Symmetry: D2
Subunit: 298 residues, 4 copies
């Protein structure tokens, strides 16, 4: 077999805005900070990057910046490129490739609730359209559908490029199911609070929200775990629980961008509708939780 | 207060394909069939019409065909125009108006899970962009979010054009809450099996899947209920239960397009990925359930 | 069949110094009878069946039977268990104490399969000679009696005559009555009493009626007589109180309301139930002030 | 704080019937088989032991047999003693102590849905009634209520006897929460498929269904994990996934008793209503899954 893979400590990059546009210099600065704090790959325009409200041109711009910023380093770019329309997801995958992405993260179709057969055909079309690695992304709370274990495994076996899945499903039983039946895949944590449990069961990385704020801590947790230093990895996972939970007190990326702004890491607490600022109470909750953590500057 | 409204028996039109393109002649012929069977409005490019996978040029085509076909008739066009990006939902509402729609149906943002404040701001922007009726559309099983009762009522009260909500949420308690607190709105059933309970509680129409296949029966049900002939409305609702439920044995519009094909009302059983044909077992179930109903031809 | 339908009340069970307040219980039942109620349910969920002893179960059923004697009002006794042998025994017990019928909750905790639920209820129904109403409340039991199982039991067992549904699932109510219109669908969810009745439901077993018996009976009887406009008007007026009565697990809010209304002297439960939070206490307090609460 | 504890590999004992009565000779023989296969504690009359349908005399009989069978060995008896009525749960706790149990497993109140405050007072009264260890048992899918992390932690800290919780909630996030905020407690897996993830996060034992059939494999999994031999523990957990899942194809203990019968370990496949035999379909599925496993006799 021997598929090409992108694994390790990875970050679902927030997308900073200034005056309604992507702040490209801030975006670059944030990526450099991830690289300097032990991150192995970055994910431009994932859910956390507000992919839904960026234009396709902004999609390109963000991917190009990530690629340029990672040159001269080992850090890879796993570009968000996914859609609930298969023709669009295919086109997005090819564009990501054309724009220098090392691999793609492709979310399960949201809203239109395809069957498992439909999911198989969707991802097969996507994988056949490019020659770079493809990571599936299961997040049923947002999409309204679940890629089943059987479908994930069938895709992994049938399509050379498809090498694993980012799970954001709060279902450790499924994580056991996946790796028990197909130990060759890369299971990637899409849920910060349970990064350590997923890694300790043989998961091989994380695509993290929390790492935007605490890249050094997420990187350490991940690399301790990858080395079977489980006591060390669990210690950081336990320490991170409070922040990992508060970062979801309202829908991601509302709390993470709020945190980045509070920390002085971005200049404006600005979103695109229908996302908006958190409630005053949640703003204050996030602020208090942060005080317990050492937040790396630039 | 005296809002412009679009109510009564309405159909979420399927979109027929032929060789990967919208079958334009067939779409017109299906709409004419709805008109001739007592339907009060049609909804081009809703969920049932595969809005997700149609291009923006195709949305335009479908809306224009609906508008042309209903011209010279009492039938209104409530065009699907909705997005999880507020800038895009505004654009699409303006476009729908420009192509002659009488009103728009605007789905709650899917996938990105805005907060109630976000939803308020989203819909306020959409309502402010046009001068035609706007019906909200709540379908949490597909979007991952819920427009709360309070948000819906605030939108109804604050925004001239917003006149009610299509509820597809299996939640009769919420239907009670909505009409007990704001009896002036138009609550529309987006769930065929429970059309009668929604209407008998003061709901004022349906946006129906089943009516694609059985337009005369849905329109009769609806009109009886609006005339307070609950006995006759319930009789048809009970008779329709079997078909109403089998049309969701797989994600809509997979079963309804299967039925339309079986009835000889569309030429090709064809979807756009990630949607695809049903399993052999479900196909057979749909075929058998159909036998109990009289299906109108052209 | 032989049936018990109409407006019915899931009686709360008042405590004083950790004992069933037998005086109070009789008095509260009298108050239900005098406010248009068609039947009472001693020792249902609302009655804290879980924490009463078998002797107290007997006592409440006896007091209900006695208070309704000579009156039009029937007693549909709570008599259910997650052990079939015990549910059979409680059914016989209820009939012995002169109940007109029993309300029998789906087994909680042990999650029997549909085949198991059928055998459970078949065993009970074949054991006594009085009406049996199934009672489906998946949020509390961890299982659901499916439409197919409910219909099969109704068709197969002469004395099983319907189901109390507490499942927030109007689709299922349509399913049940479309496929088997002869059964008695009974609302176990006050906020949606009107939608269940308007689809051909034939009664309610109500929590709210403890506090507002006249309004719940009025609503029910208007709907049974097809005055939907008046039934809906009352269902709408009741929504706020109907919702606040579940702000914490029933019967915590209804006992709180009965206490605040001066209808019971003490706000006493049996553990593990206990008084509501301060925030919820106050909410209940304020919601009640929009309603006329009848005294004795 | 030096709490007394009962941890390690533990079995929720099935209760065999013969001619409608507890088969006492079979029960003793089944317990001896557990002891001889590396089990550290047995749980008579838990959920798996059909506590709901046993009479109180039968509870006494099962506890007495477990107690007697464990004499002369290190194996402990953690007796099921719980109820949804606090007065009865107190009574059962005392009765378990009197019949020689080393500790009690006490299920959250089912059916009546107590609030967090009610749960606190429930378990506080239970803990004050005896001087032996008390393990909480959270199983929301069966009880309709959840003991929150805050409540479990408050009980652990406030009540000398309460030493931990058996979690059967499919919620590894909550397992993280519990041990991150209160590392001194004994988190026990009540969900076989996820035994390894719970143990690798610092859980200290399992109360197992699967161990009825495969006590040596569950014992080895547990002891490898407790020694931080995570590779070896995970390997068994993976191997066991298929049997762990099929043992819940119908409500436990229906599949486990079916497996014991198929294995020749009990003489009849007998339940007390409302429990009953599995479908013929599921009977066959269980039989097929077992073929892959080595099963020890007596
Ligand atoms: Mg016109």
């Amino acid at each position: 077999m021997d598929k090409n893979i992108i694994i390790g400590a990875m970050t679902a990059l927030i997308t900073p805005f200034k005056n309604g546009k992507v702040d490209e210099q801030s975006y670059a600065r944030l990526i450099k900070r991830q690289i300097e704090n032990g991150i192995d790959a970055v994910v431009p325009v994932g859910t956390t990057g507000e992919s839904a409200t960026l234009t396709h041109e902004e999609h390109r711009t963000c991917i190009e910046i990530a690629v340029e910023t990672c040159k001269g380093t080992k850090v890879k770019v796993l570009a968000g490129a996914g859609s609930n329309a298969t023709h669009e997801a295919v086109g997005l995958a090819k564009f990501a490739k054309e724009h220098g992405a090392d691999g793609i993260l492709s979310v399960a179709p949201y809203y239109n609730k395809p069957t498992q057969q439909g999911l198989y055909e969707h991802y097969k079309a996507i994988a056949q359209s490019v020659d770079i690695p493809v990571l599936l992304y299961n997040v049923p709370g947002r999409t309204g559908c679940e890629i089943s274990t059987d479908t994930i495994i069938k895709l992994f076996r049938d399509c050379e490029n498809i090498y694993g899945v980012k799970e954001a499903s709060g279902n450790i039983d499924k994580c056991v199911d996946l790796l028990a039946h197909e130990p060759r895949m890369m299971l990637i944590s899409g849920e910060d609070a349970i990064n350590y449990p997923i890694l300790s069961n043989g998961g091989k990385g994380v695509i993290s929200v929390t790492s935007n704020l605490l890249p050094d801590m997420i990187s350490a947790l991940t690399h301790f775990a990858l080395d079977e230093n489980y006591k060390e990895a669990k210690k950081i996972n336990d320490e991170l629980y409070n922040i990992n939970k508060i970062l979801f007190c309202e829908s991601n990326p509302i709390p993470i961008k709020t945190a980045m702004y509070l920390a002085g890491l971005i200049e404006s607490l600005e979103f695109r509708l229908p996302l908006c600022s958190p409630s005053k109470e949640n703003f204050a909750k996030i602020e208090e939780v942060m005080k317990k953590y050492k937040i790396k500057g630039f």
